[PDB]
């Protein structure tokens, strides 16, 4: 086990991506992957997996604030299943409940990585909770 982990935050127009290392206990965003009604260019994922060789992949399971499922939940499950079927890598789901984001010299990451922020949160959550 290399300790390398990868997480995806499923979306219909964009799928966030983060990579983590158990060895250092950290995670960071990679550029998000554009999607066409949830379908990515699978060669991007193939490349990411071959280069990072993650021990396992984590996909967020989207849920409402109260924990109930939403329309997107089923599609995220299909996505997680398709990564496992196409690449053989172990895929784990991790709950991702919606929450309120609370309400000049400013600096922000480039858009591609900003679009992967939820994937970094998923992966930090997964590691912090001890999975």
Secondary structure of the chain as H, E, C letters:
CCCEEEEEECCCCEEEEEEEECCCCEEEEEEEEEEECCEECHHHHHHHHHHHCCCEEEEEEEECCCCCECHHHHHHHHHHHHHHHHHCCCEEEEEEECCCCCCCCCCCCCHHHHCCHHHHHHHHHHHHCCC
Contact 7, 59 (CB under 8 A): yes
CATH number of 2-131: 3.30.420.140
Q: Where are the domains of the chain?
A: 2-131
Count of residues making up the chain: 131
Other CB atoms within 10 A of residue 114 CB:
13
Other CB atoms within 10 A of residue 107 CB:
4
Q: How was this model experimentally determined?
A: X-ray
The closest of 107, 131, 101 to 3, measured between CA atoms, is 131
């Amino acid at each position: 086990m290399s300790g390398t982990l990868m997480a995806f935050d499923f979306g219909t127009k964009s799928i966030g991506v983060a990579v983590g290392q158990r060895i250092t206990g950290t995670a960071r965003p990679l550029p998000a992957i554009k999607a066409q009604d949830g379908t990515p260019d699978w060669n991007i994922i193939e490349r990411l997996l071959k280069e990072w060789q993650p021990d396992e992949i984590i996909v967020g399971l989207p849920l409402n604030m109260d924990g109930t499922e939403q329309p997107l939940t089923a599609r995220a499950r299909k996505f997680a299943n398709r990564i496992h079927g196409r690449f053989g890598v172990e895929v784990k789901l991790h709950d991702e409940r919606l929450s309120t984001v609370e309400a000049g010299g400013y600096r922000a990451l480039n858009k591609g990585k900003v679009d992967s922020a939820s994937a970094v949160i998923i992966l930090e959550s997964y590691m912090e909770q001890g999975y």
